[PDB]
Amino acid sequence: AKEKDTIRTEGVVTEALPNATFRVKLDSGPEILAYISGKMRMHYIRILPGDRVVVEITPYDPTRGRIVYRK
Amino acid sequence: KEYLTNERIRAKQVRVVGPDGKQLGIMDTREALRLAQEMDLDLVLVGPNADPPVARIMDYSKWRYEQQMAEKEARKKAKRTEVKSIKFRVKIDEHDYQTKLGHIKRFLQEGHKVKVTIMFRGREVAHPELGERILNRVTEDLKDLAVVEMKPEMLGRDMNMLLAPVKV
Ligand SMILES: [Mg+2]
């Protein structure tokens, strides 16, 4: 069915967390657990703490996301 | 340093000096040799290249020993504390950082020059800033026992500093 509420806000990478997970300070507001998207994993993409990246946010937990956009 | 004795000496007329500094004159070699033999000492070529070659009467082995002493003693009581270098990464975390800082402190205490280096590999954008933030912080932490001599500086894939001890 897909809940269309998959929020597409941007963010500055803040921290290298373990296992492809990243504190990413959003341009909208707070920092959230933001794991790497599967697509990104497939195409390598070493994310570094200090990049502009777009996060896919749940409205149920807006403190947890998934980077969709490399750089 | 590094001289020849008695019979190895190839010149004829040597300027002959006693052990005290007594100028016997410019003498033919054989006579000098004889004198040396008489003295219980040896004739030593201390200036081979000069006008009449400079020959001094001394106990040569003893002199050599003395030289070795004065050398090794003085040299290695004046021997430098070199450079101690420390490597980092940009993404660095707490415990490790603290350990590194401690190491640096130790080095400073000892008296050793500190090269503080961060390796990078690629995407040199957030690279310099974070490097500064780390290295500068480290320096600040050591601002009691250490002083910056070299500022935050690029090297290609690398960022370096040089810290000197506060009192050496
Ligand atoms: Mg969703």
PDB file of C-alpha atoms and ligand atoms in Angstrom:
ATOM      1  CA  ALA A   1       0.000   0.000   0.000  1.00  0.00           C
ATOM      2  CA  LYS A   2       2.878   2.399   0.982  1.00  0.00           C
ATOM      3  CA  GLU A   3       2.346   5.249   3.434  1.00  0.00           C
ATOM      4  CA  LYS A   4       3.351   8.266   1.333  1.00  0.00           C
ATOM      5  CA  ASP A   5       4.604   9.992   4.516  1.00  0.00           C
ATOM      6  CA  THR A   6       8.231   9.032   3.678  1.00  0.00           C
ATOM      7  CA  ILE A   7       9.763  12.518   4.402  1.00  0.00           C
ATOM      8  CA  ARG A   8      12.584  13.793   2.129  1.00  0.00           C
ATOM      9  CA  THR A   9      14.542  16.416   4.175  1.00  0.00           C
ATOM     10  CA  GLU A  10      18.268  17.337   3.747  1.00  0.00           C
ATOM     11  CA  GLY A  11      21.165  17.224   6.257  1.00  0.00           C
ATOM     12  CA  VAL A  12      24.840  17.763   7.141  1.00  0.00           C
ATOM     13  CA  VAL A  13      26.658  14.527   8.157  1.00  0.00           C
ATOM     14  CA  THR A  14      27.782  14.878  11.782  1.00  0.00           C
ATOM     15  CA  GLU A  15      29.153  11.550  13.060  1.00  0.00           C
ATOM     16  CA  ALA A  16      30.641   8.289  11.957  1.00  0.00           C
ATOM     17  CA  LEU A  17      28.528   5.715  13.841  1.00  0.00           C
ATOM     18  CA  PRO A  18      29.356   1.998  13.422  1.00  0.00           C
ATOM     19  CA  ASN A  19      28.033  -0.291  10.700  1.00  0.00           C
ATOM     20  CA  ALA A  20      26.943   2.152   7.925  1.00  0.00           C
ATOM     21  CA  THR A  21      24.966   4.289  10.427  1.00  0.00           C
ATOM     22  CA  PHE A  22      25.399   8.118  10.685  1.00  0.00           C
ATOM     23  CA  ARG A  23      24.315  10.918  13.096  1.00  0.00           C
ATOM     24  CA  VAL A  24      23.292  13.378  10.288  1.00  0.00           C
ATOM     25  CA  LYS A  25      22.298  16.889  11.533  1.00  0.00           C
ATOM     26  CA  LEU A  26      19.194  17.741   9.438  1.00  0.00           C
ATOM     27  CA  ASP A  27      18.812  21.169   7.799  1.00  0.00           C
ATOM     28  CA  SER A  28      15.187  21.072   9.022  1.00  0.00           C
ATOM     29  CA  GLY A  29      16.123  20.340  12.683  1.00  0.00           C
ATOM     30  CA  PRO A  30      17.562  17.431  14.750  1.00  0.00           C
ATOM     31  CA  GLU A  31      20.117  14.600  14.274  1.00  0.00           C
ATOM     32  CA  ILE A  32      18.832  11.099  13.634  1.00  0.00           C
ATOM     33  CA  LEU A  33      20.033   7.547  13.379  1.00  0.00           C
ATOM     34  CA  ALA A  34      20.329   7.478   9.597  1.00  0.00           C
ATOM     35  CA  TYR A  35      21.534   4.198   8.155  1.00  0.00           C
ATOM     36  CA  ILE A  36      22.753   3.897   4.565  1.00  0.00           C
ATOM     37  CA  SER A  37      20.132   2.970   1.913  1.00  0.00           C
ATOM     38  CA  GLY A  38      20.520  -0.403   0.157  1.00  0.00           C
ATOM     39  CA  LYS A  39      21.106   1.227  -3.227  1.00  0.00           C
ATOM     40  CA  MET A  40      23.986   3.210  -1.748  1.00  0.00           C
ATOM     41  CA  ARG A  41      25.468   0.039  -0.251  1.00  0.00           C
ATOM     42  CA  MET A  42      25.243  -1.652  -3.642  1.00  0.00           C
ATOM     43  CA  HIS A  43      27.172   1.207  -5.399  1.00  0.00           C
ATOM     44  CA  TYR A  44      29.959   1.461  -2.685  1.00  0.00           C
ATOM     45  CA  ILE A  45      29.576   5.157  -1.524  1.00  0.00           C
ATOM     46  CA  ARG A  46      31.818   5.827   1.471  1.00  0.00           C
ATOM     47  CA  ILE A  47      29.968   8.571   3.363  1.00  0.00           C
ATOM     48  CA  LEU A  48      32.153  10.890   5.398  1.00  0.00           C
ATOM     49  CA  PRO A  49      31.216  13.071   8.418  1.00  0.00           C
ATOM     50  CA  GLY A  50      30.835  16.416   6.588  1.00  0.00           C
ATOM     51  CA  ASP A  51      28.561  15.899   3.557  1.00  0.00           C
ATOM     52  CA  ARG A  52      25.206  17.232   2.349  1.00  0.00           C
ATOM     53  CA  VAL A  53      22.861  14.193   2.291  1.00  0.00           C
ATOM     54  CA  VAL A  54      19.054  13.721   1.983  1.00  0.00           C
ATOM     55  CA  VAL A  55      17.335  11.553   4.605  1.00  0.00           C
ATOM     56  CA  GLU A  56      14.133   9.477   4.289  1.00  0.00           C
ATOM     57  CA  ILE A  57      12.264  10.106   7.582  1.00  0.00           C
ATOM     58  CA  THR A  58       9.386   8.234   9.262  1.00  0.00           C
ATOM     59  CA  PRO A  59       6.812  10.515  10.995  1.00  0.00           C
ATOM     60  CA  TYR A  60       6.469   7.846  13.767  1.00  0.00           C
ATOM     61  CA  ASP A  61      10.152   8.142  14.623  1.00  0.00           C
ATOM     62  CA  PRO A  62      11.531  11.422  13.162  1.00  0.00           C
ATOM     63  CA  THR A  63      14.800  10.746  15.058  1.00  0.00           C
ATOM     64  CA  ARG A  64      15.574   7.776  12.726  1.00  0.00           C
ATOM     65  CA  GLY A  65      16.129   7.859   8.961  1.00  0.00           C
ATOM     66  CA  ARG A  66      17.872   6.522   5.857  1.00  0.00           C
ATOM     67  CA  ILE A  67      20.215   8.457   3.563  1.00  0.00           C
ATOM     68  CA  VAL A  68      18.802   8.330   0.033  1.00  0.00           C
ATOM     69  CA  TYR A  69      21.117  10.890  -1.549  1.00  0.00           C
ATOM     70  CA  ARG A  70      24.858  10.598  -1.784  1.00  0.00           C
ATOM     71  CA  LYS A  71      26.495  14.046  -1.667  1.00  0.00           C
TER      72      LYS A  71
ATOM     73  CA  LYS B   1      90.569  12.858  13.627  1.00  0.00           C
ATOM     74  CA  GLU B   2      92.191   9.817  11.903  1.00  0.00           C
ATOM     75  CA  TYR B   3      96.010  10.069  11.619  1.00  0.00           C
ATOM     76  CA  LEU B   4      99.210   8.082  10.775  1.00  0.00           C
ATOM     77  CA  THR B   5     102.347   7.273  12.866  1.00  0.00           C
ATOM     78  CA  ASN B   6     106.158   6.935  12.898  1.00  0.00           C
ATOM     79  CA  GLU B   7     106.936   4.873   9.764  1.00  0.00           C
ATOM     80  CA  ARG B   8     103.752   5.428   7.692  1.00  0.00           C
ATOM     81  CA  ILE B   9     104.881   9.101   7.372  1.00  0.00           C
ATOM     82  CA  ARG B  10     105.878   9.858   3.748  1.00  0.00           C
ATOM     83  CA  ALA B  11     107.383  13.376   4.033  1.00  0.00           C
ATOM     84  CA  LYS B  12     111.128  14.030   4.676  1.00  0.00           C
ATOM     85  CA  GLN B  13     111.165  17.346   6.553  1.00  0.00           C
ATOM     86  CA  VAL B  14     108.575  17.460   9.287  1.00  0.00           C
ATOM     87  CA  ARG B  15     107.990  20.425  11.586  1.00  0.00           C
ATOM     88  CA  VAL B  16     108.758  18.723  14.907  1.00  0.00           C
ATOM     89  CA  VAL B  17     106.779  19.585  18.048  1.00  0.00           C
ATOM     90  CA  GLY B  18     107.205  18.064  21.533  1.00  0.00           C
ATOM     91  CA  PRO B  19     104.215  16.888  23.640  1.00  0.00           C
ATOM     92  CA  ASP B  20     104.171  20.204  25.634  1.00  0.00           C
ATOM     93  CA  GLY B  21     104.417  22.456  22.557  1.00  0.00           C
ATOM     94  CA  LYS B  22     108.232  22.670  22.239  1.00  0.00           C
ATOM     95  CA  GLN B  23     109.133  23.543  18.615  1.00  0.00           C
ATOM     96  CA  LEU B  24     112.281  21.423  17.986  1.00  0.00           C
ATOM     97  CA  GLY B  25     112.411  22.921  14.470  1.00  0.00           C
ATOM     98  CA  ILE B  26     111.844  21.497  10.991  1.00  0.00           C
ATOM     99  CA  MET B  27     113.650  18.133  11.226  1.00  0.00           C
ATOM    100  CA  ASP B  28     114.460  15.241   8.855  1.00  0.00           C
ATOM    101  CA  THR B  29     112.189  12.297   9.570  1.00  0.00           C
ATOM    102  CA  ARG B  30     114.788   9.786  10.744  1.00  0.00           C
ATOM    103  CA  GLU B  31     116.030  12.040  13.538  1.00  0.00           C
ATOM    104  CA  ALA B  32     112.450  12.672  14.666  1.00  0.00           C
ATOM    105  CA  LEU B  33     111.797   8.919  14.690  1.00  0.00           C
ATOM    106  CA  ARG B  34     114.932   8.372  16.780  1.00  0.00           C
ATOM    107  CA  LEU B  35     113.804  11.052  19.230  1.00  0.00           C
ATOM    108  CA  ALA B  36     110.384   9.403  19.502  1.00  0.00           C
ATOM    109  CA  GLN B  37     112.026   6.042  20.190  1.00  0.00           C
ATOM    110  CA  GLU B  38     114.179   7.628  22.898  1.00  0.00           C
ATOM    111  CA  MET B  39     111.171   9.349  24.591  1.00  0.00           C
ATOM    112  CA  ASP B  40     109.051   6.126  24.998  1.00  0.00           C
ATOM    113  CA  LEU B  41     106.607   8.035  22.707  1.00  0.00           C
ATOM    114  CA  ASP B  42     105.751   8.237  18.946  1.00  0.00           C
ATOM    115  CA  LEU B  43     105.848  10.804  16.126  1.00  0.00           C
ATOM    116  CA  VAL B  44     102.360  11.691  14.887  1.00  0.00           C
ATOM    117  CA  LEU B  45     101.476  13.540  11.645  1.00  0.00           C
ATOM    118  CA  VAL B  46      98.897  16.114  12.953  1.00  0.00           C
ATOM    119  CA  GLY B  47      98.999  18.429   9.889  1.00  0.00           C
ATOM    120  CA  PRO B  48      99.980  16.446   6.724  1.00  0.00           C
ATOM    121  CA  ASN B  49      98.933  19.202   4.251  1.00  0.00           C
ATOM    122  CA  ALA B  50     100.641  22.306   5.801  1.00  0.00           C
ATOM    123  CA  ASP B  51     103.941  24.071   4.990  1.00  0.00           C
ATOM    124  CA  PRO B  52     106.588  21.764   6.483  1.00  0.00           C
ATOM    125  CA  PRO B  53     104.208  18.840   7.536  1.00  0.00           C
ATOM    126  CA  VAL B  54     103.188  19.212  11.230  1.00  0.00           C
ATOM    127  CA  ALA B  55     104.569  16.357  13.363  1.00  0.00           C
ATOM    128  CA  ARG B  56     103.970  16.054  17.117  1.00  0.00           C
ATOM    129  CA  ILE B  57     105.595  13.663  19.621  1.00  0.00           C
ATOM    130  CA  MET B  58     102.937  11.876  21.764  1.00  0.00           C
ATOM    131  CA  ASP B  59     101.671   8.448  22.965  1.00  0.00           C
ATOM    132  CA  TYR B  60      99.454   7.933  19.952  1.00  0.00           C
ATOM    133  CA  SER B  61      97.190   5.127  21.143  1.00  0.00           C
ATOM    134  CA  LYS B  62      96.586   6.989  24.409  1.00  0.00           C
ATOM    135  CA  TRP B  63      95.742  10.151  22.467  1.00  0.00           C
ATOM    136  CA  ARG B  64      93.310   8.192  20.285  1.00  0.00           C
ATOM    137  CA  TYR B  65      91.654   6.765  23.391  1.00  0.00           C
ATOM    138  CA  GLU B  66      91.333  10.269  24.850  1.00  0.00           C
ATOM    139  CA  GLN B  67      89.765  11.511  21.623  1.00  0.00           C
ATOM    140  CA  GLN B  68      87.299   8.623  21.638  1.00  0.00           C
ATOM    141  CA  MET B  69      86.369   9.409  25.246  1.00  0.00           C
ATOM    142  CA  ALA B  70      85.861  13.127  24.723  1.00  0.00           C
ATOM    143  CA  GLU B  71      83.895  12.427  21.543  1.00  0.00           C
ATOM    144  CA  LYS B  72      81.496   9.735  22.748  1.00  0.00           C
ATOM    145  CA  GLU B  73      81.035  11.374  26.148  1.00  0.00           C
ATOM    146  CA  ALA B  74      80.348  14.906  24.886  1.00  0.00           C
ATOM    147  CA  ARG B  75      78.512  13.880  21.622  1.00  0.00           C
ATOM    148  CA  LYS B  76      75.956  11.662  23.338  1.00  0.00           C
ATOM    149  CA  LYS B  77      75.454  14.059  26.269  1.00  0.00           C
ATOM    150  CA  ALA B  78      74.554  16.577  23.495  1.00  0.00           C
ATOM    151  CA  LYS B  79      72.566  14.067  21.325  1.00  0.00           C
ATOM    152  CA  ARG B  80      69.197  15.276  19.985  1.00  0.00           C
ATOM    153  CA  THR B  81      65.750  14.062  21.082  1.00  0.00           C
ATOM    154  CA  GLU B  82      64.874  13.640  17.365  1.00  0.00           C
ATOM    155  CA  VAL B  83      61.256  13.790  16.180  1.00  0.00           C
ATOM    156  CA  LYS B  84      58.469  11.638  17.530  1.00  0.00           C
ATOM    157  CA  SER B  85      55.615  11.577  15.023  1.00  0.00           C
ATOM    158  CA  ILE B  86      51.996  10.611  15.758  1.00  0.00           C
ATOM    159  CA  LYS B  87      49.435   9.584  13.133  1.00  0.00           C
ATOM    160  CA  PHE B  88      45.659  10.227  13.239  1.00  0.00           C
ATOM    161  CA  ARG B  89      42.481   9.855  11.213  1.00  0.00           C
ATOM    162  CA  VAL B  90      39.766  12.489  10.664  1.00  0.00           C
ATOM    163  CA  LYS B  91      36.913  10.419  12.127  1.00  0.00           C
ATOM    164  CA  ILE B  92      38.833   9.838  15.406  1.00  0.00           C
ATOM    165  CA  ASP B  93      37.187   8.947  18.727  1.00  0.00           C
ATOM    166  CA  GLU B  94      37.647   9.367  22.436  1.00  0.00           C
ATOM    167  CA  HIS B  95      39.763   6.750  24.213  1.00  0.00           C
ATOM    168  CA  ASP B  96      42.240   6.464  21.354  1.00  0.00           C
ATOM    169  CA  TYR B  97      42.516  10.251  21.161  1.00  0.00           C
ATOM    170  CA  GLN B  98      43.221  10.430  24.886  1.00  0.00           C
ATOM    171  CA  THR B  99      45.887   7.734  24.570  1.00  0.00           C
ATOM    172  CA  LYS B 100      47.533   9.669  21.748  1.00  0.00           C
ATOM    173  CA  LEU B 101      47.465  12.849  23.834  1.00  0.00           C
ATOM    174  CA  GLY B 102      49.090  10.984  26.734  1.00  0.00           C
ATOM    175  CA  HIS B 103      51.802   9.699  24.396  1.00  0.00           C
ATOM    176  CA  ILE B 104      52.432  13.235  23.171  1.00  0.00           C
ATOM    177  CA  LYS B 105      52.654  14.475  26.775  1.00  0.00           C
ATOM    178  CA  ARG B 106      55.174  11.751  27.573  1.00  0.00           C
ATOM    179  CA  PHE B 107      57.269  12.743  24.577  1.00  0.00           C
ATOM    180  CA  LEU B 108      57.176  16.394  25.601  1.00  0.00           C
ATOM    181  CA  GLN B 109      58.267  15.483  29.127  1.00  0.00           C
ATOM    182  CA  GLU B 110      61.165  13.459  27.736  1.00  0.00           C
ATOM    183  CA  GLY B 111      62.098  16.432  25.522  1.00  0.00           C
ATOM    184  CA  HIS B 112      61.219  15.165  22.038  1.00  0.00           C
ATOM    185  CA  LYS B 113      59.991  17.151  19.036  1.00  0.00           C
ATOM    186  CA  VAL B 114      56.419  16.270  18.223  1.00  0.00           C
ATOM    187  CA  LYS B 115      55.260  15.835  14.676  1.00  0.00           C
ATOM    188  CA  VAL B 116      51.493  15.659  14.855  1.00  0.00           C
ATOM    189  CA  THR B 117      50.150  14.198  11.613  1.00  0.00           C
ATOM    190  CA  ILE B 118      46.775  13.374  10.144  1.00  0.00           C
ATOM    191  CA  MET B 119      46.612  11.032   7.174  1.00  0.00           C
ATOM    192  CA  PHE B 120      43.826  11.556   4.661  1.00  0.00           C
ATOM    193  CA  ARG B 121      42.921   9.528   1.562  1.00  0.00           C
ATOM    194  CA  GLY B 122      40.395  11.539  -0.491  1.00  0.00           C
ATOM    195  CA  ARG B 123      37.481  14.004  -0.666  1.00  0.00           C
ATOM    196  CA  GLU B 124      39.509  16.871   0.851  1.00  0.00           C
ATOM    197  CA  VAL B 125      36.502  19.135   1.793  1.00  0.00           C
ATOM    198  CA  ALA B 126      35.498  18.421   5.440  1.00  0.00           C
ATOM    199  CA  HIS B 127      39.063  17.069   5.646  1.00  0.00           C
ATOM    200  CA  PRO B 128      41.043  20.184   6.605  1.00  0.00           C
ATOM    201  CA  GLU B 129      38.443  21.530   9.036  1.00  0.00           C
ATOM    202  CA  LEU B 130      38.117  18.381  11.107  1.00  0.00           C
ATOM    203  CA  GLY B 131      41.904  17.952  11.018  1.00  0.00           C
ATOM    204  CA  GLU B 132      42.319  21.441  12.467  1.00  0.00           C
ATOM    205  CA  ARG B 133      39.624  20.815  15.067  1.00  0.00           C
ATOM    206  CA  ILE B 134      41.432  17.700  16.253  1.00  0.00           C
ATOM    207  CA  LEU B 135      45.050  18.877  16.079  1.00  0.00           C
ATOM    208  CA  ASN B 136      44.334  22.336  17.480  1.00  0.00           C
ATOM    209  CA  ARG B 137      42.348  20.781  20.335  1.00  0.00           C
ATOM    210  CA  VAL B 138      45.260  18.459  21.096  1.00  0.00           C
ATOM    211  CA  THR B 139      47.647  21.415  21.121  1.00  0.00           C
ATOM    212  CA  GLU B 140      45.327  23.316  23.461  1.00  0.00           C
ATOM    213  CA  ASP B 141      45.218  20.322  25.804  1.00  0.00           C
ATOM    214  CA  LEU B 142      49.060  20.368  25.891  1.00  0.00           C
ATOM    215  CA  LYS B 143      49.295  24.238  26.224  1.00  0.00           C
ATOM    216  CA  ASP B 144      50.831  23.800  29.728  1.00  0.00           C
ATOM    217  CA  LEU B 145      53.862  21.653  28.689  1.00  0.00           C
ATOM    218  CA  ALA B 146      53.940  22.374  24.924  1.00  0.00           C
ATOM    219  CA  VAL B 147      54.171  25.116  22.309  1.00  0.00           C
ATOM    220  CA  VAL B 148      53.251  25.216  18.630  1.00  0.00           C
ATOM    221  CA  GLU B 149      56.192  25.874  16.346  1.00  0.00           C
ATOM    222  CA  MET B 150      54.445  24.979  13.096  1.00  0.00           C
ATOM    223  CA  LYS B 151      50.835  25.893  12.363  1.00  0.00           C
ATOM    224  CA  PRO B 152      48.190  23.557  10.777  1.00  0.00           C
ATOM    225  CA  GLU B 153      49.798  22.756   7.396  1.00  0.00           C
ATOM    226  CA  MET B 154      48.977  20.744   4.264  1.00  0.00           C
ATOM    227  CA  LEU B 155      51.348  18.175   2.751  1.00  0.00           C
ATOM    228  CA  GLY B 156      49.301  16.608  -0.123  1.00  0.00           C
ATOM    229  CA  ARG B 157      47.254  13.782   1.421  1.00  0.00           C
ATOM    230  CA  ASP B 158      48.464  14.885   4.887  1.00  0.00           C
ATOM    231  CA  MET B 159      48.099  17.565   7.606  1.00  0.00           C
ATOM    232  CA  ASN B 160      50.990  18.237   9.991  1.00  0.00           C
ATOM    233  CA  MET B 161      52.102  20.175  13.046  1.00  0.00           C
ATOM    234  CA  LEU B 162      55.318  20.507  15.048  1.00  0.00           C
ATOM    235  CA  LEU B 163      55.210  20.930  18.802  1.00  0.00           C
ATOM    236  CA  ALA B 164      58.174  21.848  20.915  1.00  0.00           C
ATOM    237  CA  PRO B 165      58.485  21.307  24.715  1.00  0.00           C
ATOM    238  CA  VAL B 166      57.658  24.381  26.903  1.00  0.00           C
ATOM    239  CA  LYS B 167      60.883  24.045  28.964  1.00  0.00           C
ATOM    240  CA  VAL B 168      63.611  21.894  27.413  1.00  0.00           C
TER     241      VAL B 168
HETATM  242 MG    MG C   1       7.660   5.084   5.805  1.00  0.00          MG
END
